[PDB]
């Protein structure tokens, strides 16, 4: 998998399960084309989100539905969504891991880029 | 000021100065209307970024040009941009400070919301 | 004020008020000795924590009592405490701000140095 | 593996490899008794740091030598060390992962605790 995620819940100290996310690719005209959507499992990850064939070089946006994550827990969050925008160069089997630490009024997005 | 920012540089241990940002407002049709731009001073802040007349209830987007900040610093950044997206005055009018902690491959967005 | 703090609460999006902390100095022995205490006001700050005379060059440990903070909020924390250890050089009116972002199972420590 | 770590480098976007750490166990008198040391591999993890028998309920301290890490990376760090202190109830196959995100002037410590 060239694009992976790892979401953690900073209130309970567990992975963030059942977070919905969408992957969008920026096109020539500057617009965004949705190319995939998924939901984290109980470990805060998604497997088989997009193939290397679906993941050419270019700018991508990954939108995490963090508001619903907190609302379904009875907490009231600040952010509508968490969006991670980055220029990708999957070359030489270069893989990207988007880590995300969630609190109701704050989140941290970091990237682990390999090969 | 109803909308303040406070950007810090986690590499240098200083406020992030001269960071450019845009403030947008979600519209009825689901698009975005830009309402302001700004650039942080040397304390990492923008004074009088918007006024109360520009700030009715609704969803807003604050887009920080973090990639240009790290390029001018000589570092190579991951993120194309840093986006904070939130519903303003959902339960009534409030004031907002957006705290942002910047590293080349990571950032933390936090909100301080007061009456 | 050569040593300042700013503590935020990431659960409810406010400063963290009434957080107790201890400032310790490292001894030439190798251990710690407590030189001051304080408690954050409603803005997550402590004014007049220590003086420039109490804050000479040297290694310092600031120990934030985050466990008691989350207990008094009704939450279960992970950390027994939040410690920040750094080498201070207040040379040339150089001031330190320890920014601290608190969640029950996580905290971020960062420093702003003039 | 009841006590695991995961360290990342927020500047380069890689795991922080070759970080030294010391595991200490609070004693009845309040002192600390070192019980283990380790160094992260290239994934930012340490495997078989301590056994479940070495890890009874109690207060533990994990000290990460982040000053040496940043110096070797060519950056001047703020912190002398990163210290994670916590009360552990490892009853019923409860595992602790100490997650650590590092920048020269900032770090974030989080914990992931598995269920019994
Ligand atoms: O612990 C984290 C982590 C990240 C990537 C990964 O492959 C495994 C992890 O445990 C982690 C998650 C979110 C964050 O903001 C920082 C982290 O170190
Ligand atoms: O110290 C911070 C801060 C936040 C709000 C404010 O009005 C002033 C501050 O110094 C701060 C804390 C966490 C963070 O991710 C970014 C910050 O600027």
From TrEMBL, chain C:
GO MF term set: hormone activity; thyroid hormone binding
Localization per record: Secreted
Residue ranges annotated for the Transthyretin/hydroxyisourate hydrolase domain, each copy included: 1-114
GO cellular component, one term: extracellular region
BP GO annotations: purine nucleobase metabolic process
Keywords: Hormone, Secreted, Signal, Sulfation, Thyroid hormone, Transport
Function statement: Thyroid hormone-binding protein. Probably transports thyroxine from the bloodstream to the brain.
Quaternary assembly: Homotetramer.
Family in the record: Belongs to the transthyretin family.
Name of the protein in its database record: Transthyretin
Gene source species: Sparus aurata
Part of the full-length chain shown: 34 to 147 of 151
């Amino acid at each position: 998998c060239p694009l992976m995620v790892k979401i953690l819940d900073a209130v309970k100290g567990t992975p963030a399960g059942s977070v919905a996310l969408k992957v969008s690719q920026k096109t020539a005209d500057g617009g965004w084309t949705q190319i995939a959507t998924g939901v984290t499992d109980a470990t805060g990850e998604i497997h088989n989100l997009i193939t290397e064939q679906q993941f050419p070089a270019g700018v991508y946006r990954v939108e995490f539905d963090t508001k619903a994550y907190w609302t379904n827990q009875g907490s009231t969050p600040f952010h509508e969504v968490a969006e991670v925008v980055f220029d990708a160069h999957p070359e030489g089997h270069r893989h990207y891991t988007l880590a995300l630490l969630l609190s109701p009024f704050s989140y941290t997005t970091t990237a682990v880029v390999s090969s």
